[PDB]
């Protein structure tokens, strides 16, 4: 289908607890493929996918160099932000960013993205023109005028419209083994009585790799909602995921309800019921 590349960037001041920490994580289609980190004291836990070591140290030490120059920029960013908000030097603050590109089935760029946050709050973002900015407050308004005067949107756009989509197609081809993995969930239904009048049906999905999945309870083939509770998809720890979905059925009518599972790894969506 349609693909995405994003870098997630994090830069945190640590006055006294050492010095600033910098993290840059890269994602293809929400698959982590590279991780840079100022705290990492061995490249064993600066992980990268196989098809990144495939590129040699002439794409590690270049990106390591970019990362290291990027942190000089992030260093000033954090100092300027302290000034814009008249913050003290003893406080810890967090600058974050997400940027990247969306491409279609072929590679027609569809949209570019770049946005920032300061201490968890939207700060500034590149509009979909890739030519103009939305500021969140007076701090970001200051940032916007300087980036208007320095013509930053044009350089961001050049990266997003150029380097971004052209490196993404390379990644999509070179890591397609790793990237479209797709292990299907193993599913079962459990039953939990509460009243004499009532129980709860819990539909389990376990061990599916692409974290996207949809679970749905339905009564006589009709989708249900608020009597249906959904737990947030969680990692299992073995590069796979878990999820479940519960509904409170009235005791005796259990065989009315059916759980529908949809996931990339399934030939067809599954239907399950409680089996006593």
């Amino acid at each position: 289908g349609s693909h995405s590349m994003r870098y997630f960037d994090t830069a945190m001041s640590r006055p006294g607890r050492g010095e600033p920490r910098f993290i840059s994580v890269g994602y293809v289609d929400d698959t982590q493929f590279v991780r840079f980190d100022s705290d990492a004291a061995s490249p064993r836990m600066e992980p990268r996918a196989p098809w990144i070591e495939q590129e040699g140290p002439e794409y590690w030490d270049r990106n390591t160099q970019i990362f290291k120059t990027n942190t000089q920029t992030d260093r000033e960013s954090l100092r300027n932000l302290r000034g814009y908000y008249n913050q003290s030097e003893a406080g810890s603050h967090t600058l974050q960013s997400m940027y990247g590109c969306d491409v279609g089935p072929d590679g027609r760029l569809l949209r570019g993205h770049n946005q920032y946050a300061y201490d968890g709050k939207d700060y500034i973002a590149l509009n979909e023109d890739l030519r103009s900015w939305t500021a969140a407050d007076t701090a970001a308004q200051i940032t916007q005028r300087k980036w208007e005067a320095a013509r930053v949107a044009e350089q961001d756009r050049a990266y997003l419209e150029g380097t971004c989509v052209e490196w993404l197609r390379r990644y999509l081809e070179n890591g397609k083994d790793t990237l479209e993995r797709a292990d299907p969930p193993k599913t079962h239904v459990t039953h939990h009585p509460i009243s004499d009048h009532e129980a709860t049906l819990r539909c389990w999905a376990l061990g599916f790799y692409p974290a996207e999945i949809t679970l749905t309870w339905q009564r006589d083939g009709e989708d249900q909602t608020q009597d249906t509770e959904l737990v947030e998809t969680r990692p299992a720890g073995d590069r796979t995921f878990q999820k479940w979905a519960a509904v409170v059925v009235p005791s005796g009518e259990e065989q009315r309800y059916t759980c529908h599972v949809q996931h990339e790894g399934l030939p067809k969506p599954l239907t399950l019921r409680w089996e006593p």
């Binding site: 870098y7 990027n70 920029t73 992030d74 960013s77 320095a150 961001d156």
Partner: peptide, 9 residues
Amino acid sequence: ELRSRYWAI
């Protein structure tokens, strides 16, 4: 690949 980022906030 990483964006080269030169302009501070």
